[PDB]
Every structure is written in C-alpha cells, then in structure tokens.
Amino acid sequence: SHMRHRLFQLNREVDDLEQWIAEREVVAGSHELGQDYEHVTMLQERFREFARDTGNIGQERVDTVNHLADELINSGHSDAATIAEWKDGLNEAWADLLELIDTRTQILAASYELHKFYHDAKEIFGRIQDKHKKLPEELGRDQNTVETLQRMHTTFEHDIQALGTQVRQLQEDAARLQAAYAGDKADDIQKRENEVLEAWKSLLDACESRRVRLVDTGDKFRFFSMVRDLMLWMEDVIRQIEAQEKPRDVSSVELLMNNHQGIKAEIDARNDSFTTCIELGKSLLARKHYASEEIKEKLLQLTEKRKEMIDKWEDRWEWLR
Amino acid sequence: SHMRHRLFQLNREVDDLEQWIAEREVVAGSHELGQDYEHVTMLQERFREFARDTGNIGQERVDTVNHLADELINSGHSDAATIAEWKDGLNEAWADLLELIDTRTQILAASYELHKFYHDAKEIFGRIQDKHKKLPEELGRDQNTVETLQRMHTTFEHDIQALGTQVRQLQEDAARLQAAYAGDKADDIQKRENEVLEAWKSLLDACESRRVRLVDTGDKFRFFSMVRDLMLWMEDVIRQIEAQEKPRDVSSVELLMNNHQGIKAEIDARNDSFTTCIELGKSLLARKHYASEEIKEKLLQLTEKRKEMIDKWEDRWEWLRL
Ligand SMILES: [Mg+2]
Ligand SMILES: [Mg+2]
Ligand SMILES: [Mg+2]
Ligand SMILES: [Mg+2]
Ligand SMILES: [Mg+2]
Ligand SMILES: [Mg+2]
Ligand SMILES: [Mg+2]
Ligand SMILES: [Mg+2]
Ligand SMILES: [Mg+2]
Ligand SMILES: [Mg+2]
Ligand SMILES: [Mg+2]
Ligand SMILES: [Mg+2]
Ligand SMILES: [Mg+2]
C-alpha cells in the first residue's frame, strides 16, 4: 500500500512528463519555411536555444522517471507489466522528440547554407562591380605620371586578390551545395555562381587591358625621353665645335686637334645610348604601337641630328689636318 | 622595376600576416585553465568564438597571400627562390596555429569537465547535507499527528528523487573521468565521488528508517484506537444487559427475549471489527513491535471483555428462555 502509493505517484509523473514532451513536439515539428537569409538565421538560432533547453530539462526528468519505474519493476511489483508499459511509452515519446529535434536542426542548417550562398554571391558580386567602377581610364601625361599610375595599378591588382579569394570560396560553396540538390535548385546555384564568375572575369580582363596600355604609354615616354637626352647632348657637341677658335700658331693647332679628338671620344662614348634608343623605337614600331607616327618622326629627327653632328665634326677635323 | 614593386608589396603582406599569426598564437598558446567552473566556462566560450574568427579571417588571408606568391613564382620572378621560402614558412606558421587552436580547444574542454565534476560534487554534497539537516525526528503522539507526519515524509521522499538522479549522473561522470585519467587525479575523483555517495546513502537510510518508524507508530495508535472503540461499546452492551428488568408476565418475557436477541444481533455485527482489530494486534507482534508488551495486554483485555459480554448475554438468554 506503500507500493500502492509509489505506483500512483509514478503514474502522475509519467502523465506530467508526456504532456511536457507533447508541448515540445509542437515546436520541434514546425515546418516553418525561412523567407530569406535573415529570417532563416533567426529560425536556426531560436531552435538551437530550444533544442538545448529541451534536452537540458527533459533528459533529467526522463532519467528520474526511468529510475522510479525500474525500481518498482526490479523489485517484482505485481503491476510490473503496466509499469513497463508506462516506461516504454515515455522512452518512445522522448526518443521521437529528440529525433524530430535532430531532423529540424538539419533542415534548418541546410536552409541556412543555401540562403547564405545567395547572400555571399550578392555581396561578392556587388564588391566586384564597385571595384570595377573605381578603375581609371587614363594612362597619363609624362614619364613621371605614367610610372605613378603604373604603381597605383600594381596596388589595385594587388588589392583585388582578396576578392578573388572570396570568389574561389563561393565556387567551393556552390560545389558543396550542388551535390546536395538537383533540378531547379542545383541549376539556380549554377546560374548565380556564373553571374559572379563573369563579373570577376570582366574585372580581370579590364585590369589586364589597363596594365598593358600603361606599359605601352610608359614605353612611349621612355623612348621620347631617350631621344630628347640625345638631341640635347648632340646640340651641346655641335655648339662646342662652333665655339672653337681658328688656331693662329702651331701650339694652338696642336691644342685644338687634341681638344677636337677629345670631342670624338665624347661622341663615341654615346654609341650604346644611340643603339638602346633606336632599338626601343624600332621595337615599338614592330609591335604597331599607337604612337608609331611620332616614333618614326623622332627616329628620323635623331638620325638627321646625328648626321649634322658627325658632318660638323668631320669638317672641322679635316680642315685641322 | 615593376617586378621589384610587386616583390616588396608581397614582402609587406607576408611580414604583416606573419605578425598577425604570431598575435593569434599568443592567444591560442595560453596556459590558463580557469580558476573555477565559472571561469573555465567563460574561457571556453570566448575561445570558441576566437577559434572560429581566427580560422575564417586567417584562411582567407593565407590563401590570398599564397595566390600572390604563386603568381610571382609562376611568371618566373627573379626572386622566385626567396618568395617560395616566404610562402613555405607562412604555410607552416598557419598550419602550426591551426593545430595549436585544436590543442587549446581540447585542454579547455578537459579543464571544463574536471572543474564541472568538482562543481557538481560540491553542489550535490551540499544539497544532500542540507536535506538531511531538515529531516524531522518527531513521530507523533496520536493517530492524526502520525498521519500528518506521514504526509509530510512522503513529500520529503518526493523532494529528493531529482537529487538521486543528480547523484547517479555524478557517478556516470566520475567513471568516465576516472577512465580518462589515472594516478592521483583519478584517485581524487573517486575520493570525491565516494564522499557524495556516502552522504547520499546516509540520507536514504535515514528517510527509510523514518518512513518505517512512522508506519509502526501509526499502526500502534490505530490498534489502540480500535481496542478502545470495542471496549467502550462492550461495556455499554454489558450495562444494557444488566439494566434489563425481570419480566413478570408472558408478554414481557416475549418482549425482553426479542430485545435480547436484538442485542446479540448488534453483538454479532461487530465480528468483522474484532477480526480487524485482533489481526492488527497480531500483525504488530510478529513485527516484533517495541510496544509488544502493551499490545499483548490490550489484546487480552479485549478478548476477556468480549468473553464477559458474551457470557453475560448467554446466561441471561438461558434464564429467560426457560
Ligand atoms: Mg496513464
Ligand atoms: Mg505526437
Ligand atoms: Mg527580410
Ligand atoms: Mg493491459
Ligand atoms: Mg503511451
Ligand atoms: Mg646653329
Ligand atoms: Mg559546453
Ligand atoms: Mg637562397
Ligand atoms: Mg507539523
Ligand atoms: Mg544519461
Ligand atoms: Mg480506527
Ligand atoms: Mg416464542
Ligand atoms: Mg431488535
């Protein structure tokens, strides 16, 4: 009759607990669809709290009821068959709930991952386009400004590799998600990934086209500066020659021939500078440079000035003979 | 000199990332285990976040720098040999940081479970000792008060069921940790476990001793009560028989014989009550009740009074019916 009370008490506890499990099953059984990334995020985080609260509270109560029932069954209570029936029904209900919590937790993780893909694709896409937009058209005005622009571009191309990394990550996510799904869905992931890859492709193509144009414009201004330096120098040598005073005695002839021969040494020492300059110019022509017409003009001006200079040197020498 | 710019640019990114990795490694390399349960709980959560952030931020940066280094090597940069040296060492530093994060996660997890065992053992030992301090000693002085105390002891016994489940959980935790470690640490755990189990046992034995002494005490009062009810009744039946007037004519004799047979009817109606009472008394004696001497005296007073009542009823009936 103590065993009578113990039995009546256990019945109460089992009924209380199964009622509590049924309450939790309503929540765990929710089929609520996430409307967008923000909402699925909320859903997942709420249910993670719920799963943990449910497990914490329920496991202890289930263990207590199981203990009470096992004590009565093990002691050979005359209602052992009924008591075992109670215990089985409870353990089944609890196992079913935990299974359902598992299934919903999975479904919400899958959904989260899928919404996150579309989210990251929107964000990478926007970052790509925003970067594409900050990309100068101009090549620049002289040697000094072109080399600054070249260095800025080198930094820009540096400063997009981080987006590249994010693009490759998106590609891996798309791959993982496409294995999960099929039909309409795996298709839409492919399209979305493609939109981002094409935007990326276009940014790189534009960075490469700009790198190349800056090299071309740089080479142009390099060539022009080589020509200018030679032209200025040649005019100096010509003026040097023009400044020479006709000798009035043998010691003056000797001095002037020595000085003039010094000038030939100056001239000859520039041979490699002419070669470097002319080779570059001829290179640019071979590659159909946009400034080919200027470049021929400058090559012709250089060779006409060089002839002026050599003619003037030879005329002076041969009259000093 | 383009190629030089890219080299120095990479150089900076490499040294920067390595700095950043060194900073994360200081955090991952902490040897702080937590001063108590609360502390290690917090340590553990905060590094959980740290490990996630570090891995996510870190991996992208490493991968970014590898790509840039690989671009330079693949295009035959003059310093490809040196670049590959920077790259290789960065990757080693990153992989080292990742293993170190796994290591810290593991020993935080281990510290957490050890702290928690000692936190639970102290909580439970304290709860058991507190419950045991609140166990009453009084058994009651009458049937009603025993009944009340029994209700209250039932509640007490109910109150400690969840406490039992916590003790059993601690035993589970104790065996798992004892299997996990060994030497003086495992010994320390078994020591703490046995302390709780002994207090638990002490409480359970006390609750059961009380439960039983309350049943015994209540049964004694209930038996004494049953005997008293029968004694008072019997003495009144004897008084009713003794009050009867000697009949003086045939009609009176017939009326009295009827009324007398009515009295037997009333007497015989108590057969179940006597049986219940006597069986209770006998049940206490086989129990070896501590009041056995007084229970025996009462059984005898009861049966002797019933024999007296019956004898007086029968002697009256005999004299009447002749
Ligand atoms: Mg039921
Ligand atoms: Mg259901
Ligand atoms: Mg919204
Ligand atoms: Mg049945
Ligand atoms: Mg059921
Ligand atoms: Mg002139
Ligand atoms: Mg934890
Ligand atoms: Mg070396
Ligand atoms: Mg009281
Ligand atoms: Mg368990
Ligand atoms: Mg009674
Ligand atoms: Mg008659
Ligand atoms: Mg009558």
> Token pair for residue B163?
């406490």
- Listed in sequence order, the DSSP H helices in chain B are 2-28, 37-74, 80-133, 143-159, 161-180, 184-242, 250-268, 271-286, 292-321
- Return the structure tokens found at B1: 């000199």
**Binary contact (A60, B9; C-beta < 8 A):** no
Where on the phi/psi map is residue B247: left (φ > 0), alpha (ψ -120 to 50), or beta? beta
d(CA A309, CA B221): 144
Task: Tell how far the Cα of A25 is from the centroid of ligand 2, in angstroms.
Answer: 7
Q: Is the CB of A154 less than 8 angstroms away from the CB of B68?
A: no
Provide the b/e sequence for A282-299 (b: ≥16 CB within 10 Å).
Answer: eebeeeebebeebbeebb
CB atoms within 10 A of CB A271: 9
Contact B205, B263 (CB under 8 A): no
CB of A63 within 8 Å of a chain B CB? The answer is yes
Ion ligand 3, residues whose Cβ is below 5 A away: A 36, 38
**Residues B101, B51 contacting (CB under 8 angstroms):** yes
Lookup: tokens for B212: 């039983």
Q: Which residue has the tokens 């179940």?
A: B272
Contacts (Cβ under 8 Å, ≥6 apart) of A54: A24, A28, A97, A101
Distances B258 to B262, B265, B268 between C-alpha atoms, Å: 6, 11, 15
Residue-wise over B231-255: b if at least 16 C-beta within 10 A, else e? eebbeebbeebeeeeeeeeeeeeee
Distance CA A26, CA A141 (A): 73
Contacts of A63 in chain B (CB under 8 A): 165, 168-169
Residues A54, A21: contact at Cβ < 8 Å? no
User: Which structural technique was applied?
Assistant: X-ray
Distances A141 to A145, A147, A163 between C-alpha atoms, Å: 6, 10, 31
- Determine whether B302 is exposed, middle or buried from the number of CB atoms within 10 Å of its CB (0-12, 13-18, 19+): buried
Q: How many CA atoms lie within 13 A of A138 on its CB side?
A: 10
Four-point Cα dihedral B240, B242, B247, B251, nearest 10:
20
Radius of gyration from C-alpha coordinates of chain A: 44
Write out the two tokens for A224: 């022009």
Please check whether residue B45 touches A, CB under 8 A.
no
Which residues make Cβ contacts (< 8 Å) with residue B127, sequence separation at least 6?
Answer: B163, B166
Residues in chain B: 322
Distance between CA atoms of residues B132 and B208, nearest Å: 12
List, in order, residues 6 or more apart from A49 with CB less than 8 Å away. none
Alpha carbon dihedral A279, A282, A284, A288, in 10-degree steps, equals: -160
Residue with tokens 């419950």: B131
Going from the Cα of A16 to the center of ligand 1, the distance in angstroms, rounded, reads 10
Among the bound ligands, name the one nearest to the CA of residue B276: 11
Interface contact flag, A5 B158, Cβ < 8 Å: no
> Quick check: helix, strand or coil at residue A79?
coil
User: Tokens 């414009």 identify what position?
Assistant: A217
Using CA atoms of A74, A77, A82, A84 in order, give the dihedral in degrees to the nearest 10.
0
B30: left (phi over 0), alpha (psi -120 to 50) or beta: beta
CA distance from start to end of chain A:
148
- Contact B67/A162, CB-based, under 8 Å? no
Centre a 10 Å sphere on the Cβ of residue A87 and count the other Cβ atoms it contains: 20
| A160 C-alpha to ligand 8 centroid (Å) | 30
From the centroid of its chain, how far is CA B211?
Answer: 17
Chain B residues with CB under 8 Å of A161 CB are: 64, 67-68
Q: Which domains does chain A have, with CATH numbers?
A: 3-138 (1.20.58.60), 139-321 (1.20.58.60)
